[PDB]
Amino acid sequence: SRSYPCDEKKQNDSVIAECSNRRLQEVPQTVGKYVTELDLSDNFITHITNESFQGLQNLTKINLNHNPNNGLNITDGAFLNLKNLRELLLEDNQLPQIPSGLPESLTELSLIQNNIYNITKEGISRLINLKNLYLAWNCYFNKVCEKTNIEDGVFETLTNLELLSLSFNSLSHVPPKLPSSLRKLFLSNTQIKYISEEDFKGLINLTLLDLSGNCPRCFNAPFPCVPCDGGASINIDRFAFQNLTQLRYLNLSSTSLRKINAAWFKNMPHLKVLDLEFNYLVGEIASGAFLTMLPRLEILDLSFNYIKGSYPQHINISRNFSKLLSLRALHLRGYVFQELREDDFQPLMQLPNLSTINLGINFIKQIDFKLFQNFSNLEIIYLSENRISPLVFDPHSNFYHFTRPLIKPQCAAYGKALDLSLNSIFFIGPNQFENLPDIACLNLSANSNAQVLSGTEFSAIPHVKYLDLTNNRLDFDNASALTELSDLEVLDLSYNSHYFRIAGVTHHLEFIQNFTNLKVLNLSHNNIYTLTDKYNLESKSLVELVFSGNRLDILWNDDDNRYISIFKGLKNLTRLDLSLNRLKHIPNEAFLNLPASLTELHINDNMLKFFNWTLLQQFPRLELLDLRGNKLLFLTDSLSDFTSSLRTLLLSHNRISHLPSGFVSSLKHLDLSSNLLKTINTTKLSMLELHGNPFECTCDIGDFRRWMDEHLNVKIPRLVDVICASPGDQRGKSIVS
Amino acid sequence: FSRSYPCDEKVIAECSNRRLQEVPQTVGKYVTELDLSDNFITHITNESFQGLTKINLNHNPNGLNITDGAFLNLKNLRELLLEDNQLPQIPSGLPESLTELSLIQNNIYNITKEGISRLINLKNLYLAWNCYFNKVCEKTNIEDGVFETLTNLELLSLSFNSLSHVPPKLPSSLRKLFLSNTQIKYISEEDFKGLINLTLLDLSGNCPRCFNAPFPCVPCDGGASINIDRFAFQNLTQLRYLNLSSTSLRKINAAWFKNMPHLKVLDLEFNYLVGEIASGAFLTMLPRLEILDLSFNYIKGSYPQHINISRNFSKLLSLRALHLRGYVFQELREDDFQPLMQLPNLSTINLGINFIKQIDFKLFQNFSNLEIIYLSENRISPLVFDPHSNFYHFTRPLIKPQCAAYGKALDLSLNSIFFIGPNQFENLPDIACLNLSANSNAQVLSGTEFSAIPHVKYLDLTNNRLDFDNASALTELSDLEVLDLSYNSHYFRIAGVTHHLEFIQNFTNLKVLNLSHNNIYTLTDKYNLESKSLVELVFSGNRLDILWNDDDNRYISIFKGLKNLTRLDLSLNRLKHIPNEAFLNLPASLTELHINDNMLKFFNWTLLQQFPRLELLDLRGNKLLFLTDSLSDFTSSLRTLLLSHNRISHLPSGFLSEVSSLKHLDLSSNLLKTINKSALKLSMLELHGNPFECTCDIGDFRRWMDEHLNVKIPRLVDVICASPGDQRGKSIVSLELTTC
């Protein structure tokens, strides 16, 4: 049978029910008995009783987050009948207290983003099987919340607990009687001003300790904060981390630290990640005794440690940075200094495993680029948001660290990456890339660069494979533009316009024919409406062309039909994006001249009023045709006469009111959602999208309903959104039942 | 005594953008000027205007067929505008009375005597943009001596036409000769010999600097400059304006100015004159020059340390404005600008888009009477289309006049001032207007940053990341009158962004405050804004929906403390409804209240009683359904009520006949099917965009429109019938009420 209202899926030897965002006012009683994991998040469920999951005895995981989208009423012992429930997520439910009578079988419990101010034995201590306990964000920057009360010895009985998260709660003191089984202790933003010798003594298995946001550096803080009296730092006793021999992660970000006691690391020889951002450590970076205590540190973050009102000429890096033998990544954003000299970075040049140097947001005016060559194995050189000139919310997130890749993985995958985006490189200077290592990935985005590309600018780094030139004012009309980058595979020219042309802008794309290895070209939002001498693009290697945000309506509306074969020369194109080109219709001869090698064609978000389906005959390899967001009214009744390869047909957000007698053995995905269908009058179809249509739920919908029951292989997603528009009697209800 | 259709009568007849397919025959006989531009008019015949001194037919049809002698019957026609009509030739038989003729943007390639010579009364002749960078156009042929007979011609515009040579036999009556982008590579001694009354000569875009050009261009062979003979401007003794922009000039012959002692404006933008700026012999020939523009004269590939300015710049005694954008250099030293410090009338220095990293700001004090210091788009760090336009000159005010009106103006917008350095404003003159917009400035304002220039009256801090939560922020600027904090957000706050606006109570002279797009949804200690002087508050783009939706009603008197306010902008605050007590707590001193572009489903009209000075209520772009029937019971001051883009379907009985103060009523783009007999000093009524039901029910309103001709109803062609189907697509006025 077809599941409702949930989307049941087979996951790793289990059956899962995706039942989120369905507007459900209560727990559905139509859930499969075989289902073991239930996701009911983002609904209007208001009550959970003993008879809420009565027919679902085999459940191991329940997610009730963000319910109801004025709190969630849960009865005492509502979950007690679920003898195999191991993971219960009750986040953002406005709970006033921890639910009474929770099953002892629980190994993972989350109560994040509630109004729980009393952590009691009555609700926690009976759960001896708990391994992960999340109680963060209960008493944070909000009213009614004064202090979180943690009953003495509540966690003492949880001898299997490996993760305890008490972050964003007014604690003021590290809770006593914590179980020695602990591995991760999260105490961020807990108002803990002092850490004593007895606070973590028993935690000999602790691998992660998060103490960030306690005594925050408030002008820099990501959250509304009150600093410790007199702007004081966190007070950590000399022997606080004395028996934390297994520590791998220590987060001390935004703790107003001015001095770092080197004795804190004497017993952690395995510390791998140390987060020291948002502190006052400019002096400690210059003469850090602690640097000699971290031989196994791989990630060091000393970002946003700038001195308020200061813009020093140089960065002072202690020579003891050379004792960080295991270092893989150094993050030094927001130090804010004017010049980087070759000698300032001498301590780092001996680190054999140093692959990332993060110097973003430093406002560096001058860098001696020859210094980068003197590095063992640099892979990422991140210099975004500096001032180099032409050389002639989610509560489960990391709030202090930039976790996303600094450079796009697709770029970095080619080799040594140099990110010089958002700097003052308004033209490419004659010596711009002098003394640079073998750069394979280069970002020069958003530099206000209005260079006239001639074929000499990138000769100093000729092995660039991926070049990002987006959000600039480049002139590439010379047919020799970028030809010095003979190995170029990816070229991003998005959001580009001539700096001075006001009345007429005529593009010359002859340079593209010079590349023997160019595979991806993005000319999006270049506002291209006329071509110069060569009116038609040519390439033997080009695989993908992104032409969105251009004026193909103007080009293909030419009185002389000059742009009738504009992309015919791209003999190996498999992907073409023609979205956002204001197209009302594509001329039959202009469509027939698209490359026959195409497999994915996107003409979405245009204004197409007509589409000659017959022309699909000239494209035997076309598997995806995307026509969403147009104004099409007719569908061909002879689709199998025009295609035998089409697998996906995307047609949502169009004006289709009639499905013709015929709806193609190749077609697997048919998207007809958000159209104007009132009714639907052996296939190999695996998905049919129909939500958003004005279905008329009279006896006429019965034939289609019978079709839905015979073909259970055809997955119809979002059945709660396949709704009756008429009659008034059925309006709002789903076409099912 | 009758309502004009399809035109709006003033005696001018505004008849533009009306979708007219032919010249209306319902134009008043008294009308002397007719504007028919931006219409679908395709034909103009002898019987077109049979039943005028000025006619505008521009942009028709959105080519234009005009018959020979179609305008000959108009014996008093003195101005005919035929721009952008796809005309293949100059219309035959034009009236001899013409004093102003414009034929721009057509396809006229032959300038003949048959069409021009007989119009001896011409004073202004525009033939620009006929043979420009478009096809079929080869070269404009100008018949020998066509302009010779036009002995009254004072302006001749031949710009954007393939001329290749200056036309011979031009009348000595000429005053302005526009020859921009005409493909004239050489100017000889005999070209402008007879033009002894010439006051303006535009030769820009002839041999253009193509990398910098605003138009697709081909440069002169070998990148050569315009060749101007030593004695080309020999008898041009009256020249005031000379435009030589984008002419690829490398050298300037000083002999060109020997006979023009009255030259006032000289445009040399977009040339190769870095060397001439350093040692210009021509600088000694311009004692009456007021405006000099030497912009975008940078050397390709170059970023010099300093700007080399010739000492002969001190010989420009009448200089008022110097424009030096796009020179592109690194440091401005006090000594590089020494030649300019003696110029007694030099009030504007334009150094925008120069990428200057360091400026010795003490140099500005050594100037006699500077009032505009424009340094936008530089690199200063924290110190610890229209064819009738000027394509090469920045004509708009450098600094907003509202700012500059206060005193010496300093524009440091779009620079690298990411924080206000301790010495940021040291050695600066008495600055009264300061722009620090778009600097990515995330300074924590404490009350010490602007102490070196304490007499700032207008401060633009928009598009920054400022922190003004300290109650002492900007209080050192005790004379501050205007403060623009638009588009501002904390650089680091991610989860919660609480504002503290206590700093506003410290100002005794603050009049205008713009907090638009600050996304304000909560206040810290002071839940109320207070000021004795504040007169205008712009609060658009904030979260008054969150503030006025407070469970504890903390923000119920949020603006009550602004005792002197007369203008309040609450647009774009996502408001579904304003609590009665929150509305009653707005200052009673209001005269203009804007709650437009919100989502208002309800408005309590009764509350308008607490605002005896309210003259403008702007409620456009909301979702209101009801209007009170007792508007005169709640107000007597209201003059303008804007209700367009709402869901109003019924106009209540005695809405208009009660409000004697109401002068402008905007009810356009609503859901009105009819205007009842029962709902019938108003000077304007907007009604276009409504689904009017054109049955005999619309007849009462139509009679009302005929009785009150003083009530101007604009866009009558857009006040259209929605029903029934027969009457659909027709204007409510274009109906035959005789059936009723």
Ligand SMILES: *[C@@H]1O[C@H](CO)[C@@H](O[C@@H]2O[C@H](CO)[C@@H](O[C@@H]3O[C@H](CO[C@H]4O[C@H](CO)[C@@H](O)[C@H](O)[C@@H]4O)[C@@H](O)[C@H](O[C@H]4O[C@H](CO)[C@@H](O)[C@H](O)[C@@H]4O[C@H]4O[C@H](CO)[C@@H](O)[C@H](O)[C@@H]4O)[C@@H]3O)[C@H](O)[C@H]2NC(C)=O)[C@H](O)[C@H]1NC(C)=O
């Ligand atoms: C102070 O500094 C410390 C570091 O010293 C830092 O600790 C780190 O905190 C973050 C955030 O709380 C932790 O990140 C989470 O880690 C879990 C577990 O990761 C491991 O296990 C999984 C398998 O279970 C592996 O795949 C993974 O590689 C790891 O080995 C992740 O499961 C979390 O991911 C979820 O959230 C992300 C967004 O935040 C999503 O991108 C992601 O898809 C995950 O979503 C989940 O829910 C979705 C439904 O909403 C569902 O669709 C998904 O499929 C999925 O189930 C997340 O990465 C990190 O582990 C901590 N570090 C250590 C070593 O423990 C502190 O945060 C920092 N303090 C502050 C205040 O900044």
Ligand SMILES: *[C@@H]1O[C@H](CO)[C@@H](O[C@@H]2O[C@H](CO)[C@@H](O[C@@H]3O[C@H](CO[C@H]4O[C@H](CO)[C@@H](O)[C@H](O)[C@@H]4O)[C@@H](O)[C@H](O[C@H]4O[C@H](CO)[C@@H](O)[C@H](O)[C@@H]4O[C@H]4O[C@H](CO)[C@@H](O)[C@H](O)[C@@H]4O)[C@@H]3O)[C@H](O)[C@H]2NC(C)=O)[C@H](O)[C@H]1NC(C)=O
């Ligand atoms: C100019 O034009 C270029 C060319 O189009 C463009 O670059 C390309 O951008 C697209 C994204 O817009 C990139 O495609 C994405 O790539 C990531 C990562 O790549 C993986 O590739 C292989 C797998 O083949 C891995 O081995 C490798 O390690 C990388 O991880 C993919 O993760 C993306 O997939 C998701 O989105 C697809 C739709 O875009 C889905 O079809 C797919 O199923 C994925 O879904 C994921 O996200 C869902 C939420 O959205 C989530 O629910 C799912 O569970 C799942 O996680 C995607 O394929 C492409 O690689 C870029 N190409 C190059 C050469 O860089 C530029 O961005 C453009 N520039 C501008 C300024 O516009």
Ligand SMILES: *[C@@H]1O[C@H](CO)[C@@H](O[C@@H]2O[C@H](CO)[C@@H](O[C@@H]3O[C@H](CO[C@H]4O[C@H](CO)[C@@H](O)[C@H](O)[C@@H]4O)[C@@H](O)[C@H](O[C@H]4O[C@H](CO)[C@@H](O)[C@H](O)[C@@H]4O)[C@@H]3O)[C@H](O)[C@H]2NC(C)=O)[C@H](O)[C@H]1NC(C)=O
């Ligand atoms: C080369 O350099 C020369 C200067 O040496 C430039 O010449 C100027 O060109 C512009 C544009 O063609 C001229 O501007 C127009 O002037 C008209 C007359 O202005 C005077 O008279 C009116 C009253 O009739 C006064 O109000 C006004 O203050 C002046 O004293 C205006 O009527 C024009 O207005 C039009 O535009 C405005 C908006 O800007 C609209 O509001 C109007 O309704 C109307 O549409 C316009 O301002 C200018 O006068 C020329 N200078 C001289 C001294 O003649 C060349 O343009 C330049 N060449 C190139 C290619 O850049």
Ligand SMILES: *[C@@H]1O[C@H](CO)[C@@H](O[C@@H]2O[C@H](CO)[C@@H](O[C@@H]3O[C@H](CO[C@H]4O[C@H](CO)[C@@H](O)[C@H](O)[C@@H]4O)[C@@H](O)[C@H](O[C@H]4O[C@H](CO)[C@@H](O)[C@H](O)[C@@H]4O)[C@@H]3O)[C@H](O)[C@H]2NC(C)=O)[C@H](O)[C@H]1NC(C)=O
């Ligand atoms: C933050 O908020 C402030 C305050 O609202 C904004 O500054 C005001 O901006 C408006 C425009 O949005 C300015 O008003 C305009 O002034 C123009 C020039 O001022 C003339 O004033 C008198 C006439 O009373 C003249 O004597 C004088 O010589 C000036 O020429 C007017 O030309 C404008 O009028 C036109 O528009 C209005 C409607 O806006 C029509 O009623 C008119 O008929 C006409 O068509 C207009 O009045 C205002 O002066 C600015 N105030 C200050 C203090 O600068 C900021 O722009 C805003 N910032 C951001 C980023 O949004």
Ligand SMILES: *[C@@H]1O[C@H](CO)[C@@H](O[C@@H]2O[C@H](CO)[C@@H](O[C@@H]3O[C@H](CO)[C@@H](O)[C@H](O)[C@@H]3O)[C@H](O)[C@H]2NC(C)=O)[C@H](O)[C@H]1NC(C)=O
């Ligand atoms: C070259 O440098 C530019 C500029 O730094 C890079 O642009 C940035 O790209 C990332 C990812 O494409 C964008 O991040 C996005 O941020 C939002 C909001 O935080 C988040 O919701 C998204 O999921 C995403 O992570 C970022 O906005 C964008 N910045 C700008 C100014 O455009 C570009 O990616 C770099 N290119 C290469 C080849 O690395």
Ligand SMILES: *[C@@H]1O[C@H](CO)[C@@H](O[C@@H]2O[C@H](CO)[C@@H](O[C@@H]3O[C@H](CO)[C@@H](O)[C@H](O)[C@@H]3O)[C@H](O)[C@H]2NC(C)=O)[C@H](O)[C@H]1NC(C)=O
């Ligand atoms: C302070 O400096 C900023 C940045 O230069 C000024 O902003 C600029 O202001 C002008 C006028 O308000 C904007 O001009 C507009 O340009 C368009 C397109 O050319 C035109 O169609 C409009 O009619 C208008 O003239 C300009 O875009 C804007 N620039 C930015 C980046 O915002 C600001 O005006 C200065 N403030 C003071 C007090 O002078």
Ligand SMILES: N#Cc1ccc(N2C[C@H](N)C[C@H](C(F)(F)F)C2)c2cccnc12
């Ligand atoms: N007082 C003060 C300062 C305010 C803001 C600053 N910067 C703002 C930039 N937008 C981002 C920069 C970051 F975040 F990268 F450090 C900080 C300062 C930098 C160095 C010294 N003082 C200040």
Ligand SMILES: N#Cc1ccc(N2C[C@H](N)C[C@H](C(F)(F)F)C2)c2cccnc12
């Ligand atoms: N080759 C080359 C150059 C290209 C672009 C430049 N700049 C682009 C800026 N975006 C605006 C700057 C302007 F227009 F202000 F001068 C010119 C150069 C400036 C100085 C020297 N060479 C070049």
Ligand SMILES: *[C@@H]1O[C@H](CO)[C@@H](O)[C@H](O)[C@H]1NC(C)=O
């Ligand atoms: C919760 O549900 C119970 C019944 O199960 C009811 O008596 C009670 O009033 C509800 N409300 C709250 C706030 O507990």
Ligand SMILES: *[C@@H]1O[C@H](CO)[C@@H](O)[C@H](O)[C@H]1NC(C)=O
């Ligand atoms: C460097 O990294 C490699 C693996 O990436 C590892 O085997 C080696 O031991 C590391 N060296 C140091 C000194 O940490």
Ligand SMILES: *[C@@H]1O[C@H](CO)[C@@H](O)[C@H](O)[C@H]1NC(C)=O
């Ligand atoms: C293209 O660049 C080269 C190198 O600067 C130059 O020789 C060539 O003339 C340029 N092409 C054009 C059309 O200017």
Ligand SMILES: *[C@@H]1O[C@H](CO)[C@@H](O)[C@H](O)[C@H]1NC(C)=O
């Ligand atoms: C040609 O197309 C194929 C298929 O997308 C691709 O693998 C190949 O790299 C393209 N170009 C060349 C020259 O190999």
Ligand SMILES: *[C@@H]1O[C@H](CO)[C@@H](O)[C@H](O)[C@H]1NC(C)=O
């Ligand atoms: C589709 O294009 C073909 C040309 O290949 C033409 O014969 C046919 O009539 C077109 N169909 C429509 C509906 O225009």
Ligand SMILES: *[C@@H]1O[C@H](CO)[C@@H](O)[C@H](O)[C@H]1NC(C)=O
């Ligand atoms: C300076 O300007 C005033 C009027 O603004 C004028 O009277 C005076 O003659 C000018 N001085 C020079 C040297 O041009």
Ligand SMILES: *[C@@H]1O[C@H](CO)[C@@H](O)[C@H](O)[C@H]1NC(C)=O
């Ligand atoms: C405001 O700024 C002054 C000057 O820096 C400082 O003394 C004062 O304490 C600041 N106020 C707050 C609330 O921090």
Ligand SMILES: *[C@@H]1O[C@H](CO)[C@@H](O)[C@H](O)[C@H]1NC(C)=O
């Ligand atoms: C109130 O505003 C008016 C502006 O017209 C001004 O004259 C008056 O002085 C202001 N009152 C105070 C106390 O600033």
